[PDB]
């Protein structure tokens, strides 16, 4: 059974859910899935302390609500496993400074970067590599934005294995994609992104029906006269995106939906999409609030998951320290 590692930032969209996460929720029996809430990555951006703690718990209950089963998968908070920072430091010594500056798009020799960017923002690719390599990870699902970081982890693993023997597994990307690419609501040729400054482009899993219905009702459609609800990505991006969102929620095929909307207006299409999406989020949010309000259950999940995570992580760290040449701590 392959080991799969995902990091979960404590700061999710329907594109994330109906794309990666929903499919992974159904593969917890096919892979040894590990979910790490990366609160040590989070502090690379300064934030109120009390919001960070809350958002760590929000992220945990959200992933449980999405269906991550802590009896089947390991889910845990990054800072609860000291080995993450321990390996991160050690791997810094096997990472070229030049590799990390390539990641900043070589903007680190300037004065603007020197005066404002903290060393965490510069060094976090090595900590991400430590996250992956601690668990003998075989598979890391990543979007396009993380391919360079994943490649660095593979390079570090191979460089270390070449010096010391096979201590790490060389991780691979997870190549197959699921769902459709959910497109942003006001620019239907750009993928919906959790990062978008225009929040009207995005549906978050924790928005209420009312706000979600407003955004879907305002989604950009085409000028075809008469209006035709028909799938055509090239010429009808907005209408096709709406159909793709509806099909991904309901499982109805696009030809079926095209038959449903024969002779109907774009407003009736938007209404149906808004209802379907709004229905999916209510189920999710109902489960979310049950988990989130049970502080003791959430505490028991984090304790169990960090104990599971620690057992594997310490084995790797002991082998790294032995290979490096450290004197073992007496026990």
Ligand X SMILES: Nc1ncnc2c1ncn2[C@@H]1O[C@H](COP(=O)(O)OP(=O)(O)OP(=O)(O)O)[C@@H](O)[C@H]1O
Ligand Y SMILES: C[C@H]1c2c[nH]c3cccc(c23)S[C@H]1C(=O)O
Q: What is the DSSP string of 289-321?
A: HHHHT-HHHHHHHHHHHHHHHHHHHHHHHHHHH
Is 194 assigned a catalytic role? yes
The item of ligand Y, a copy of itself, ligand X, none sharing an interface with residue 195, based on CB under 5 to 8 Å by kind, is ligand X
169 is catalytic: no
Mark whether 54 is an active-site residue: no
In the bound state with ligand Y, the residue whose beta carbon lies nearer, of 41 and 169, is 41
Q: Is the dihedral of CA 15, 301, 291, 77 positive or negative?
A: negative
How far separated are the first and last CA of the chain, in Å rounded? 33
Binding site for a copy of itself (CB under 8 A): 39-40, 43-44, 46-53, 56-57, 77, 79-80, 82-83, 85-86, 88-90, 92-102, 108, 110-111, 113-123, 126-127, 164, 299-300, 302-303, 306, 321, 323-327, 329-330
Q: Give the residue carrying structure tokens 């991550």.
A: 68
Binding footprint of ligand X on the chain (CB under 6 A): 8-9, 11, 13, 15-16, 18-20, 141-143, 145-146, 179-182, 191-195
Determine the 3-state secondary structure of 75 from DSSP. Answer: strand
- The residue within the footprint of ligand Y, chosen from 4, 57, 61, 128 (CB under 6 A), is 128
**DSSP states of 219-260 as a string?**
------SS------TTT-HHHHHHHHHHHHHH---HHHHHHH
Instruction: Please identify, using beta-carbon distances, which residue of 37 and 192 lies nearer to a copy of itself.
Output: 37
- Contact in structure between 36 and 7 (CB atoms under 8 Å): yes
Q: Considering the rule CB under 6 A, would residue 133 count as an interface residue with ligand Y?
A: no
Restricting to residues 135-164, name those near Mg ion by CB under 5 A. Answer: 143, 145
Nearer to ligand Y, 50 or 195 (CB): 195
Other C-beta atoms lying within 10 Å of the C-beta of residue 150: 20
Q: Which of 191, 264, 308, 318 is catalytic?
A: 191
Question: Kind of pairing, strands 172-173 and 3-8?
Answer: unpaired
Residue 146 is a binding residue for ligand Y (CB under 6 A) = yes
Establish whether 325 is an annotated binding residue. no
Residue whose CB is less far from ligand Y, 38 or 277: 38
Q: Is position 18 annotated in a ligand binding site?
A: no
The C-alpha atoms of residue 100 and residue 122 are separated, in whole angstroms, by 7
| Contacts with 125 (C-beta within 8 Å, 6 or more apart), sequence order | 95, 99, 100, 103, 149, 152
> Measured from the CB of residue 269, what is the shortest distance to a copy of itself in angstroms?
41
Contact status: 5 vs ligand Y (CB under 6 A): yes
Flag whether 144 is marked binding: yes
Q: How many residues bind Mg ion (CB under 5 A)?
A: 2
Decide: residue 190, CB within 10 A, 0-12 exposed, 13-18 middle, 19+ buried.
Answer: middle
Interacting residues with ligand Y (CB under 6 A): 5-9, 38, 41, 128, 131-132, 140, 142, 146
**Which residues sit in the known binding site for L-tryptophan?**
131
Please state the residue numbers annotated as binding site: 9-11, 15-16, 131, 143-145, 182, 191-195
Residues with a catalytic annotation lie at 109, 191, 194
């Amino acid at each position: 059974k392959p080991i799969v590692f995902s990091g979960a930032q404590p700061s999710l969209t329907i594109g994330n859910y109906m794309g990666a996460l929903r499919q992974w929720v159904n593969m917890q029996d096919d892979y040894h899935c590990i979910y790490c809430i990366v609160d040590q990555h989070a502090i690379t951006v300064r934030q109120d302390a009390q919001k960070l703690r809350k958002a760590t718990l929000d992220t945990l209950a959200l992933y449980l609500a999405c269906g991550i089963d802590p009896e089947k998968s390991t889910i845990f908070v990054q800072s609860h496993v000291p080995e993450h920072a321990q390996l991160g430091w050690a791997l810094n010594c096997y990472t070229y400074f030049g590799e990390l500056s390539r990641m900043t798009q070589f903007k680190d020799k300037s004065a603007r970067y020197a005066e404002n960017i903290n060393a965490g923002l510069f060094d976090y690719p090595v900590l991400m590599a430590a996250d992956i390599l601690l668990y003998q990870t075989n598979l890391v699902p990543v979007g396009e934005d993380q391919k360079q970081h994943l490649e660095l982890s593979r390079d570090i693993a191979q460089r270390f294995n070449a010096l010391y023997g096979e201590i790490f597994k060389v991780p691979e990307p997870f190549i197959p994609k699921s769902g459709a690419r959910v497109m942003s609501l006001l620019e239907p040729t750009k993928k919906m992104s959790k990062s978008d400054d225009n929040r009207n482009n995005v549906i978050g899993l924790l928005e209420d029906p009312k706000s979600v219905v407003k955004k879907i009702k305002r989604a950009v459609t085409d000028s075809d006269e008469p209006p035709v609800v028909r799938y055509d990505v090239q010429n009808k991006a907005g209408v096709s995106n709406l159909l793709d969102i509806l099909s991904a929620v309901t499982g109805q095929s696009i030809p079926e939906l095209e038959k449903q909307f024969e002779g109907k207006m774009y407003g009736h299409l938007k209404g149906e999409v808004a209802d379907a999406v709004s229905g999916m989020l209510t189920e999710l949010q109902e489960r979310y609030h049950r988990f989130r309000n049970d502080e003791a259950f959430l505490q028991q999940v984090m304790k169990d998951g960090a104990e599971k995570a620690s057992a594997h992580a310490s084995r790797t760290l002991k082998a790294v320290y032995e290979a490096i040449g450290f004197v073992a701590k007496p026990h």
